[PDB]
């Protein structure tokens, strides 16, 4: 197995680059990878908090007695008991997939690859980030680890939904990175001239008028607009 | 009297970074800790005695949602509140805090000597007076009993039938409203639109805008304020409730 | 050591006693001092370790006594190794 | 021989401390401010316990590690944006 | 005086007539947990009472509050109750509610029976004179101090009975006031349960080798406390082992081979099981003697192992594996370089078992493992009750340790008397440091804010065992004058503190005129007095009287108002 720690290109990840631009490592490597991973620091001020009082008690010997007492407790297990389980799960259990697990990773995959095409189809440009058959059977080997650590001879379609939510909080949280602007000026500024400042109207209306249309999405951003009733009304949120 | 003193003094002398005030505090240092310190020996004497607990008794009010361990503690950081809201006296205003805390041997940034409002909000937008046609929104958590019963630019009072029917609106409003309202992502933060959706498209768990305990701390107030207030009907709608 | 230890304002006679050659810089010299003692490297039930050593970067004009402060450091401390620019690769600095 | 000890502290100002760091990091500023950022303060709290023989961090060795920590950063800013740092990092170098 | 050691065989065969029925289970045993001699001696009884096949019940009780809601809960059925380790010096019959004409059947004929008798055994001094006297329900096993030295107390307590003008009532003032100098002083104990039972059982005839080394188990408890009682009940502990043994000694060792022996048992700490340098350097005699918290402990400390010629490495290798050359000179070694650092005491005589060929093993370090075994075996009157039930839980983990077949158990227990040991070390060494221990005129306070480890303290007896340390350490300190020391440790789970109020000792082996007079700790009637008015929500029901309970924010008031008191 290959577990890898790289680094984006300028220290941070500089999302106003490409995506391409920020990762020097070409589609070839990047195609065997299966999970590929992107934290970010999003200097949130209690999640700072948090993180540092996890670590001022690691620091003043408070670790040492609150995981001792937690592996206790049952919730957390040392190294050595975790080394065996895996060895004996692994010798002992080789899953493989249901038919309709099958079909619900057949239709997953050919979602994921629409997305990427529409995704490219927007950007006009090749994204650095590939999905391929190889991905495919990531998915599939996911799946049999899920099952594997459950000694379950066949896998479920739970082990299915948690590969799919595993790899769209990784591989599609990579693949959805985004560094007309013209068409999106104007939608701009023709919906704030045109939309009232403490009013809102249907999505539809905003269709009629007349893409993408991910200027909205960048203004919701901004919050400026904000889409309640399901996405079908767009309220000025007062900016 | 430090601050109208201090502010005198600063214009005689010309006639926020930096303002009229910036030694205020020294009027009262030496008295100020000098008393907290006399405070708290006393307290200390009588805080365990009985008969001297019907002093240290912290009294219910309609927005109590603040556990008090110590009146003499929280009359220190009420104090400390109010005199840190000027900007220019800042850092003088907090080492005076550290060193009342000192007397308490309680850190400066410490959690508890951290100070909250013990008063939390219960509003009633647009509450119109049946005579004056006055436009107003009554409060009762903070607000005092004598400008909820009445109105503010006359003094005739308010039926207290209104007063319950519109609470109890604005109660029912705020549980359809959570009960109606509607779904986003956990991660993208993107807006709920379809019905049959585990999680959102990246992995996102759906959440409601209107959190659970938001409508609970709800609930909580107005039954305080019926209890507090005596709201009958109120309070039959709140045993409707559960 | 432990008479003067038991001295208050001890850290400051130190932190002036980093580089009685070169006047001012009082931070500087107060991070060299941090820098020399250095921390206790915490290692977590051997799972998690942290560095304990300080490390310390100076970004200055010529002329400003830098070179002159490492090389009182290096005379100082129990340990001390001084690699310049150019003259001293990357395998060279770590293991070959 | 000294190996200092962190028990007598306050995770609370030191929390605070680090938030409003990475909080005026991310906002209007470059100096990268990360967990290791975070443990460089105990580190330097540690190195001063050190230089004064002490087995524990007193207070003073952790609000002089605050203000060297918060004068780096206030020093790495632009001077456009300096002042106003220093005024809302003044409230944690009490005493000092 | 109620059962003098004469007539034990009487109670016994009263209880017998009374609970031998083995259709029900009329016989309840309640034993303090936390107390290595209750252990011993519930041990001793549970054999002796297998062996006449009478159903009984053991119950380890931590608080009186728990035994007071057991007594409650108890069925009326039980005709004979037992108490080991508590109950000798407070009113039961008001603390369970308990009067005569409720439990009294087949009142006649001078002689009065009862549907429940209760049998307390405890050698804490303060014998309670309405429970000595004045009550047929609780009967009391004396040690002959009653007899003997309360015969004043009696006569009191008598005119008092009986009487319930001017010169009668200033009879009754002298009375009273004689009964109550015989009250208001500290708890002390004179001799050991284990050794009034072996005394018993000698007295039924049904003895043992098991019985006879339950017995030493039992007096070695006392022997860091009670030193004094100790060198008393030696010799009576000594000549039974002489004469149980079989005369054919020096027999070839075969795997059966059970041998109690008299060897030099030297004052260490797990000798046996730990290295000669690690024993010196937890061992709190040792310790106390040189002060190793200072770092010219640890020097001089490597000043006596090269003095003595033996190499560190050497010193710091596990027992078993030492050189047979060392392991068979170590006495002559100690008489040549023990003297000249003062650790003359150190050598001593002690009983040794040992158990075919799974190695020997000596008394004190056993009753450290069954100490290490009861501290550490496994919204705030909560979790306190569940902190509770894992005290209790470890009452039986130390039980089943004294168990020859489980001897892995008595592994773990040695293991966790080292850790213990070392903990105790460091603490004491950090507080010595930061000189946490404020000196007064009525006690030296020593209160644990924050730091290492200090979830470890609540446990009653790893705060005592602190305590033996803090204390063995001031004891050699002759500057240090004799004052009793004060411990809490707050617990940020419950937000209280667990104040130990401690007596201070004579250092071992000074023996003087002032030795022989015992330390009385006056903590009692101070703490509940303390505690009676100005309500702090004081939490007193350890059988121990001198361990309270304080809430975080009372703590400060209640050590004011204590140094306010002079009662103690
Ligand atoms: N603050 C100072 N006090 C005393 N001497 C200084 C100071 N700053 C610079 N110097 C002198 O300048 C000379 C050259 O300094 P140098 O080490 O080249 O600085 P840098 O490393 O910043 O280029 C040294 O001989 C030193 O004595
Ligand atoms: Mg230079
Ligand atoms: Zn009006
Ligand atoms: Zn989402």
Same mark, same amino acid.
């Given at each position: ?31 065997? @990878? ?25 620091? &003043? ?38 038919? %309709? ?22 950007? &006009? ?30 896998? %479920? ?9 595993? @790899?769209?909080?990784? &591989? ?16 701009? %500024? ?14 539809? &209306? ?25 996405? %079908? ?7 | ?242 | ?38 921390? *206790?490297?915490?290692? *977590? ?10 490390? *310390? ?40 | ?96 | ?425 460091? =603490? ?86 002032? =030795? ?53």
């Amino acid at each position: 197995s290959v577990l890898a720690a790289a680094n984006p290109i300028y220290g941070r990840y500089d999302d106003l680059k490409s995506p391409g631009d920020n990762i020097d490592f070409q589609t070839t490597i990047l195609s065997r @990878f299966d999970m590929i991973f992107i934290v970010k620091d999003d200097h949130n001020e209690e999640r700072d908090i948090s993180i540092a009082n996890h670590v001022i008690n690691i620091h &003043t010997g408070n670790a040492n007695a609150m995981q001792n007492q937690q592996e206790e407790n049952g919730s957390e297990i040392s190294i050595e008991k975790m080394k065996r389980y895996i060895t004996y799960c692994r010798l002992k259990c080789a899953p493989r997939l249901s038919p %309709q697990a099958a079909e619900k990773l057949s239709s997953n995959f050919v979602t994921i690859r629409k997305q990427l095409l529409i995704n490219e189809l927007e950007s &006009t440009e090749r994204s650095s980030i590939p999905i391929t058959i190889r991905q495919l059977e990531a998915i599939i080997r996911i799946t049999e680890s899920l099952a594997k650590l459950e000694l379950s001879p066949i896998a %479920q379609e739970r082990h299915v939904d948690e590969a799919i939510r595993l @790899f769209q909080a990784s &591989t599609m949280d990579a693949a959805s990175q985004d560094p007309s602007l013209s068409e999106i000026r104007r939608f701009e %500024q023709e919906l704030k001239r045109r939309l009232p400042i403490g009013w809102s109207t249907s999505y539809q &209306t905003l269709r009629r008028e007349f893409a993408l249309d991910k200027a909205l999405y960048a203004l919701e951003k901004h919050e400026t607009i904000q889409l309640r009733h399901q996405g %079908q009304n767009i309220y000025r949120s007062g900016v | 009297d430090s601050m109208l003193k201090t502010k005198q003094s600063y214009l005689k002398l010309n006639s926020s970074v930096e303002n009229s005030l910036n030694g205020f505090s020294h009027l009262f240092s030496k008295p100020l800790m000098k008393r907290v310190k006399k405070l708290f020996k006393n307290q200390q004497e009588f805080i365990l005695d009985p008969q001297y607990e019907a002093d240290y008794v912290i009294p219910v009010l309609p927005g109590s949602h603040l556990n008090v361990k110590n009146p003499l503690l929280e009359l220190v950081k009420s104090l400390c509140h109010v005199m840190l809201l000027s900007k220019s006296t800042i850092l003088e205003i907090r080492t005076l805090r550290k060193e009342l805390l000192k007397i308490f041997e309680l850190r400066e940034f410490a959690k508890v000597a951290e100070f909250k409002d013990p008063s939390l909000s219960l509003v009633v937008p647009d509450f119109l007076c049946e005579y004056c046609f006055f436009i107003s929104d009554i409060d009762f958590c903070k607000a005092a009993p004598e400008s909820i019963f009445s109105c503010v630019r006359c003094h005739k009072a308010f039926n207290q039938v209104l007063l319950q029917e519109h609470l109890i609106q604005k109660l029912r409003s705020d549980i359809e409203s959570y009960l109606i309202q509607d779904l986003r992502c956990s991660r993208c933060h993107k807006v709920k639109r379809d019905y049959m959706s585990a999680h959102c498209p990246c992995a996102g768990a759906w959440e409601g805008t209107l959190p659970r305990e938001s409508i609970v701390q709800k609930l909580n107030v107005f039954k305080q304020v019926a209890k507090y207030y005596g709201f009958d009907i109120l309070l039959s709608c709140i045993a409707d409730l559960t | 050591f432990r008479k003067i230890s038991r001295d208050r304002g001890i850290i400051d006679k130190i932190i002036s006693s980093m580089a009685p050659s070169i006047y001012g810089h009082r931070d500087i010299k107060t991070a060299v001092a941090c820098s020399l003692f250095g921390g *206790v490297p915490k290692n *977590v039930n051997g799972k998690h370790s942290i560095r304990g050593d300080i490390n *310390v970067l100076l970004l200055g004009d010529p002329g400003t006594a830098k070179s002159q402060i490492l090389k009182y450091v290096e005379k100082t401390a129990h340990r001390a190794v001084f690699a310049t620019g150019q003259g001293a690769s990357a395998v060279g600095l770590t293991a070959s | 021989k000294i190996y200092p000890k962190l028990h007598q502290m306050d995770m609370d100002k030191v929390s605070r401390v680090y938030a409003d760091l990475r909080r005026e990091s991310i906002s209007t500023g470059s100096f990268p401010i990360t967990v290791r950022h975070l443990e460089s303060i105990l580190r330097i709290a540690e190195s001063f316990a050190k230089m004064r023989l002490s087995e524990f961090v007193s207070s003073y060795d952790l609000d002089r590690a605050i203000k060297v920590v918060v004068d780096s950063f206030v020093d790495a800013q632009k001077v456009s944006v300096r002042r106003q740092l220093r005024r809302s990092f003044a409230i944690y170098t009490l005493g000092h | 005086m109620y059962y003098g050691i004469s007539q034990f065989s009487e109670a016994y065969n009263k209880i017998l007539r009374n609970s031998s029925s083995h259709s029900s289970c009329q016989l309840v045993i309640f034993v303090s947990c936390l107390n290595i001699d209750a252990l011993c001696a519930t041990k001793m009884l549970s054999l002796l009472f297998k062996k006449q096949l009478v159903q009984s019940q053991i119950v380890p009780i931590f608080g009186y509050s728990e035994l007071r809601r057991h007594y409650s809960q108890l069925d009326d059925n039980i005709n004979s109750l037992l108490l080991v380790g508590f109950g000798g010096v407070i009113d039961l019959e008001a603390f369970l509610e308990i009067d005569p004409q409720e439990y009294v059947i087949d009142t006649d004929s001078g002689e009065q029976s009862f549907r429940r008798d209760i049998y307390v055994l405890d050698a804490h001094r303060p014998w309670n004179l309405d429970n000595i006297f004045g009550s047929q329900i609780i009967q009391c096993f004396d040690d002959g101090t009653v007899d003997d030295t309360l015969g004043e107390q009696k006569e009191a307590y008598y005119k008092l009975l009986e009487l319930d003008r001017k010169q009668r009532k200033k009879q009754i003032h002298e009375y009273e006031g004689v009964l109550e100098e015989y009250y208001s002083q500290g708890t002390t104990v004179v001799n050991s349960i284990s050794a009034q039972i072996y005394s018993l059982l000698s007295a039924i005839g049904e003895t043992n080798l098991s019985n006879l080394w339950l017995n030493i188990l039992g007096t070695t408890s006392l022997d860091i406390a009670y030193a004094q009682v100790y060198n008393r009940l030696y010799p009576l502990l000594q000549d039974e082992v002489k004469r149980l043994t079989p005369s054919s000694r020096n027999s070839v060792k075969t795997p059966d081979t059970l041998t109690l022996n008299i060897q030099p048992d030297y004052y260490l700490f797990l000798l046996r099981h730990s290295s000669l340098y690690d024993s010196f350097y937890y061992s709190n005699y040792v310790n106390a003697k040189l002060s190793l918290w200072n770092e010219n402990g640890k020097k001089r400390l490597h000043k006596m192992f090269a003095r003595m010629g033996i190499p560190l490495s050497t010193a710091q290798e596990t027992w078993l594996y030492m050189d047979h050359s060392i392991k068979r000179e170590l006495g002559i070694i100690f008489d040549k370089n023990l003297d000249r650092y003062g650790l003359q005491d150190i050598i001593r005589d002690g009983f040794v078992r040992t158990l075919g060929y799974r190695g020997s093993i000596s008394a004190s370090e056993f009753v450290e493992a069954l100490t290490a075994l009861l501290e550490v075996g496994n919204n705030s009157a909560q979790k306190l009750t569940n902190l509770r039930k894992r005290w209790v839980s470890n009452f039986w983990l130390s039980w089943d340790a004294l168990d020859d077949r489980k001897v892995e158990l008595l592994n773990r227990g040695i293991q966790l008397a080292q850790d213990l040991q070392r903990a105790i070390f460091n =603490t004491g060494v950090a507080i010595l440091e930061k000189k946490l221990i404020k000196h007064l005129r009525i006690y030296r306070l020593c209160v644990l804010q924050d730091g290492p480890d200090l979830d470890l303290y609540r446990n009653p007896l790893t705060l005592l065992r602190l305590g033996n340390w803090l204390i063995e350490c001031c004891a050699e300190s002759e500057d240090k004058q004799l004052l009793p020391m004060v411990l809490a440790s707050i617990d940020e789970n419950t937000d209280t503190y667990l104040v130990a109020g401690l007596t201070p000792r004579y250092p071992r082996g000074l023996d003087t005129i002032h =030795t022989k007079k015992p330390i009385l700790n006056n903590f009692s009637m101070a703490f509940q007095q303390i505690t009676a008015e100005t309500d702090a929500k004081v939490r007193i029901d350890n059988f121990e009287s001198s361990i309270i309970e304080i809430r975080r924010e009372d703590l400060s008031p209640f050590l004011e108002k204590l140094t306010l008191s002079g009662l103690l």
